[PDB]
Amino acid sequence: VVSTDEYVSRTSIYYYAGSSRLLAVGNPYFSIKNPTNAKKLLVPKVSGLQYRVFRVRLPDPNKFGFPDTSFYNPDTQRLVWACVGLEIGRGQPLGVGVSGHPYLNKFDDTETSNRYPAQPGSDNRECLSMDYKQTQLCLIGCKPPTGEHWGKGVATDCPPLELFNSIIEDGDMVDTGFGCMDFGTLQANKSDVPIDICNSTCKYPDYLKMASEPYGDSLFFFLRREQMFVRHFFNRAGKLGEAVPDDLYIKGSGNTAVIQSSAFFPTPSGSIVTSESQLFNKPYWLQRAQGHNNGICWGNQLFVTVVDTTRSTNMTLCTEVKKESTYKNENFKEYVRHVEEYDLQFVFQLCKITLTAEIMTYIHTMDSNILEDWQFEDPLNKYTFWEVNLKEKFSADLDQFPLGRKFLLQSGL
Amino acid sequence: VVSTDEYVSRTSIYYYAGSSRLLAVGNPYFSIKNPTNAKKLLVPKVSGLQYRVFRVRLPDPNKFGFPDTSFYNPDTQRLVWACVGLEIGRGQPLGVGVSGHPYLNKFDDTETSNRYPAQPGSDNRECLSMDYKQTQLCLIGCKPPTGEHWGKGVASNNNAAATDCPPLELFNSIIEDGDMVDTGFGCMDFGTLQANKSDVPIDICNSTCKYPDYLKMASEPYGDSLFFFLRREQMFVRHFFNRAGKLGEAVPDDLYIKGSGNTAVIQSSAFFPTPSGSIVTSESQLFNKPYWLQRAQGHNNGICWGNQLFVTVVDTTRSTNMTLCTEVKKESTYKNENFKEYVRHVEEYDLQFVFQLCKITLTAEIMTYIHTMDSNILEDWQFEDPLNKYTFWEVNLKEKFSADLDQFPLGRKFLLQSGL
Amino acid sequence: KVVSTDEYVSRTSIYYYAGSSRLLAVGNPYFSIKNPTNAKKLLVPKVSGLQYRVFRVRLPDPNKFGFPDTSFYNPDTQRLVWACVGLEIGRGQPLGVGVSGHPYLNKFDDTETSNRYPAQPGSDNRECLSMDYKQTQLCLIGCKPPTGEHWGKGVASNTDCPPLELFNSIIEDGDMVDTGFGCMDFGTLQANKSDVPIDICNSTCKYPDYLKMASEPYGDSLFFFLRREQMFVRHFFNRAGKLGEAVPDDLYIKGSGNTAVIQSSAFFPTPSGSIVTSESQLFNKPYWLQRAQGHNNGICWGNQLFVTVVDTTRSTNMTLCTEVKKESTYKNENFKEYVRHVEEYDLQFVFQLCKITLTAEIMTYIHTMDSNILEDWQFEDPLNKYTFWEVNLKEKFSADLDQFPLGRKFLLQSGL
Amino acid sequence: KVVSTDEYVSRTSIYYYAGSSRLLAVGNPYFSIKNPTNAKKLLVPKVSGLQYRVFRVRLPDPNKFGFPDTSFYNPDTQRLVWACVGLEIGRGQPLGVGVSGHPYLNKFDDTETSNRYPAQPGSDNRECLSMDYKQTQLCLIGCKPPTGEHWGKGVASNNTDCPPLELFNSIIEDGDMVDTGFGCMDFGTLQANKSDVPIDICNSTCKYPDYLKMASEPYGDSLFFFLRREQMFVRHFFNRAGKLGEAVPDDLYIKGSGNTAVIQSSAFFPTPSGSIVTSESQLFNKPYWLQRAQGHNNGICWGNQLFVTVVDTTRSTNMTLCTEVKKESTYKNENFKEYVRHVEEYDLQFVFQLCKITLTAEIMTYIHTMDSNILEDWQFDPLNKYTFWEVNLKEKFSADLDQFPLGRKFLLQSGL
């Protein structure tokens, strides 16, 4: 495997493309179905802790209406776009939202005072909330990102754990402080984590697997910033599945004869968000990727993956059902909505490849579909991505646009 | 007595080696037997507060299949690998786990309100938890690291009168894989020095917490222990408690005026704090970035004697403990007796190395130096292993060495950095 | 009239290394325990992270040292002296924080959020509370022991508040640093012995008088120093006991009924040293003593040097527990609890050999500065009344800076 | 037309050191203690870390100074003036935080988490609370006393009864209180209950430096140089007792009923906290080189005087003193008296540059417009009504800068 600087010839033709305003509005905890088809969403789940995986569609340069095609020979060459600049615009103010569970499996507060004897009832769940771990990240490539999470493996009665790799889809949940796991399958009570992840799979980017792939199509460039601390200390209700061994304590008696549950769990906190720590609203110049793919958008497509918990503010909405002169709780309905604002901006460089017998063999082994589409079913359609169609958004006047002006100053053109 | 840069000749031959994905899955608090008798683990001990001591096995370059061996003469020279690049990959998200004890010897909260008289009873232990001190460190050498801890000393004199506090002795020992790092209660043998086994959480209460004896390892003559190291520790006091039980050393009378009535019975001044490692951040990460071992501070400039390498890692920044829950009986209403709760912790590593081939001409002056330094070097060169009693995470790279540095991530980083 | 030690101390190219090896202190962080048999001999010494470590480092007399070649100076007209050019204060043990308290702490009400009227005052309302002290790092190096400051009882002259006087004194090994309650003689100025935790309540906390030591003419006290202090207020309490200075009537409108009896305005805070981090460490790194701010540029007169260290970042107090009676069920009456604290030091030095030609002009200058210099050169010791941690390096000098760690760091820095 | 004093003040190569030596202030951090009769006789002065320290530094008149060689200028056409080129504000005492409170603080309910209806009934619900103030470090240097700002009671209304507010400018005097987190205001006049803020400011005027006015003055005599560092956060949330003077309008809420019919007071107020003090954030104990001022006066000490204004809350530690009235074998509160004391330690160090001015007809006209007193004092006090800490350096000037710490720093910095 060689670099795309040894067989992809760079041209001096640059183009701008922008997504304009992208908006997502919904409920941060769960979706609302249609009263006509359960399997049809009326209000989608939109949360600051969701992955935003943008599948960016580029116009086929081999079919693009260039005013002058004398810069290459279609009899022996084909064209492909190379990403050289990107800025992920983010609207809405900085803030933090909270998530919780009306029946959170919290038993005792194990921070300062939890004396014996225990109070174990058949149902001791509580209505608690918390602020999740703070995470910012962005990934760029011509291949959808690869995530990792823990699920139920193959066969103590503890469920076997297996690390699964999967494509991170738009709407997938990021880790929140409880790990990257399938809460739906590994926590059968549905009450050990808040409702917005309790029946979901939280995925973490498999940076090691994506960095080590031979061609490097997944990670042209990435930034990441995670932070959390332990805010509170609780324990779980229910039978402890793995008792503390006898060599770890001296047995109690009387009021201490019934040992309490050592199934502790912490609540996370993402602490403060600040403008100075933002990874977004600034341009990334994709000059030299660490992998062998230096920003070449094979197949005329690009994947933009974003996590931004720094704007997770959840808005409170309230409606007046009955107008009365004195306040009565039964007169109002409370709702929670969350929004996300994106503005994706790109700078692309047109490239040509002379398809010699050596390069055709190299490209065929790398991806046979590349040569077929060049004229020289899509397995990615089973996944869910936020598609960004830039086929009609390419402009050669980079100065008219913000990111384009930044690009001309950076490159000296 | 001198540096290994004038008798270790550097070549332009470089090789990459990677461990691929390494996973450990187990219980963060204790191991579980299989059973089928003891000494057979069903759930191994895996904790974010454990030392990860990787014994990396390299192929013997004197027996390695180089495509061209005309670069040295085996009649008078021997080959050895030199580490010039390293990146410790870390999977799993950043996070913090908690540890506790269902019978922690905590009596009163001594922070704001603890009025007289005290209410002491034969058993006042409580089910409390805490988040430990945060610690990141990575040590590199061709010799396993040496740790320090406090243990029980020698019975000594004044068996009577005097004080019956156990004698303390500072012990040095090899840090083994799975050993516990200090957590905020010190580097001591909790199993022997805390006989009630209720003063610290269960994951260390019958364990020995070890801290790297940096001063001893830096001062060793040849410098085989620490080619390179990074460290980052932080903690603050989260809560203030005191111990139950008889106070072994009473407060002297010249430090207070005696009480009376309800304050006549003095409370115990055996205080102890709970630690907290505060926040973990990506900006403070020591891992997932390359270390270029250009110039060691010691006399061993990255020469992997014995064709092996030791990478010791502590990383509490990914100590998240996962909660698992199984449904024993499916019913329409929630009942606690219908579920079993479990706690699991995982660790993901991916060790990446770049090595530089080196040759040593065995003159009488160099043979004298190598034999005095370590006679086994010449014997293994032909010109049992006392470390087998210890427990290490072995990483076998004998079949993983590749000369195509551009194909691999760290290799590409090495070529760009060195300008090759 | 004071000149610099660069105008009359000739530098040589001869360097020597010396190291103290492992230095350990093990004891109780709150108090010492005397031997019943010997009132002047100790069974458990007081060892605490809030203590000054004042090392009196003894150097070999270079005028009698066994140099392999002594053709570099003339003993008929010259004398030798060591100059310190490099230092690293090694610190063992992990980073951590210890706590101090008082079983009868004079705390009445928590005055932070809720302290309603009327007050409930009683003849004994002391409590068993603890706290974490102010965090302090410092290192002082010179050929003279450091000068500290603290507040004590002044002279009684014509309110019954004790008169205050700021005293200067030599900081001795084992002296307590200020903990957040100030640099004062708690034994004399706090007669109830319950206003601060027990580890300082009968002690004198001293703060380094940087201004006095920096301004002294010859500059023997501070060749070099580093310092890092930090604290915030964790809790707010008030004192029990009679208020000595009542609030004047022009500062409030009088209460009545349940508010007629004014509560005590003798407030006091609890300190907190906050977090310790590796990035803020002052130790385990070399200090190059190239150019002192004073006129003494690291010349170790009298073949000795004083290193004063405070390091509260490793103040962890270890809990020890012994089993008196082994039973199948846990009973408190079967165990004894103890507290121990330890400190580990490793002092490393690089010295530069110096020669001084004793002209008529220089002999007069040295005689005025310190007559003992010429007398000891042959051309009782008042510091023995003080207590220092003695570090004897007379047999530890080596000219082979190669194998030793700080020497290698020095060779890289100096380019040799 | 204001020009710079680099176009008409000729610089000489004559430099002088001057130091105040150790300055100490000892008193009560909450209030001064007068005589039991005499209005203006102080027994214990008010000394607080939240006070302005405004030093009026007196320099010797260089036109009458005994220079060893006076051949450097011509008195027939020239006059002399001192220029400040170096300054170090030495600070003794340890870093720490003090607390202030009020035994009858007008706090009603804790409005942070739980303040359910109904309101609690009571003609007097004040509480004994304390707090740590906003943290403030600053230093101001000039030849004119600094100008502060504060809010007081304005002029009357032509017919809500809220007192009218007016922003007042005034000279900051030594001992004046800085803002503490409750604003720069005349608490004595604007808070008539004397219970809304702690006692050390409840009958005081808190002033903030009018940086904008002093920066905008034409000649720039107020600010040769300044540093400032402020920080605070909200620690707790309370409300005031007493009638709410301005009711919440009806369009901002739906009226309550039954248990919620009587609205609680929305007159909230927070308690401040200055958070942690650290050595790394210190503004003092370091030299300031006054090379090029932003104003037109580049450090010219007109009138042979200098003003140093300092606020430093990082050493606000209040010491607890306790006296034993009756010595008994058991602790009894009625046997002890509790006191609170605060101290401040200063060491002002200066390097001055001698300057000459050729008094042409154009310059005499320019200086007369600037300040007629300059030429009158040259033979070519309205500030006495104010209270300053007088520092007489007339006999403290020395030409041997190397003998002194800050002087050595000046020679090292300038390369002389």
Residue numbers in the entry:
A (entry chain B): 21 to 175, 183 to 403, 437 to 473
B (entry chain A): 21 to 403, 437 to 473
C (entry chain C): 20 to 177, 183 to 403, 437 to 473
D (entry chain D): 20 to 178, 183 to 403, 438 to 473
Show passages lifted from the paper.
HPVs are non-enveloped, double-stranded DNA viruses comprising multiple copies of the major (L1) and minor (L2) capsid proteins. High-level neutralizing antibodies elicited by L1 VLPs can block HPV infection; however, protection against HPV infection is type-restricted, and there tends to be little cross-reactivity among HPV types. Each L1 monomer folds into a canonical, eight-stranded β-barrel (BIDG-CHEF), with the strands joined via flexible surface loops (BC, DE, EF, FG, HI).
We solved the crystal structures of pentamers of the lead double and triple chimeric candidates H58-33BC and H58-33BC-52HI to resolutions of 2.5Å and 3.5Å, respectively. By loop swapping with a few aa mutations on HPV58 L1—i.e., S80N, N82T, N84A and V87L for BC loop, T375K, G378S and D383E for HI loop —the resurfaced structural contours of the BC and HI loops of the chimera nearly recapitulate those of the HPV33 BC loop (middle and right) and HPV52 HI loop (right), respectively. These subtle structural resurfacing changes in the engineered regions might provide structural evidence for the cross-protective immunity of the chimeric proteins. H58-33BC-52DE and H58-33BC-52HI also showed high titers (2,280–23,440 and 2,180–87,430, respectively; P < 0.001) as compared with the H58-33BC control. Monkeys (n = 4 per group) were administered with 5 μg of the H58-33BC-52HI chimeric VLPs formulated with aluminum adjuvant at week 0 and 8. Nevertheless, the cross-reactive antibody titers for HPV33 were significantly (26-fold) higher with the chimeric VLPs (960 to 6,290, P < 0.001) than with the HPV58 WT VLPs; reciprocally, the anti-HPV58 antibody titer (6,060 to 40,960) of H58-33BC-52HI was also 54-fold higher than that of HPV33 WT VLPs (P < 0.001). Based on our immunogenicity assays in mice and non-human privates, we have successfully generated triple-type chimeric HPV proteins that can simultaneously present three independent immunodominant epitopes, using seven or fewer amino acid substitutions.
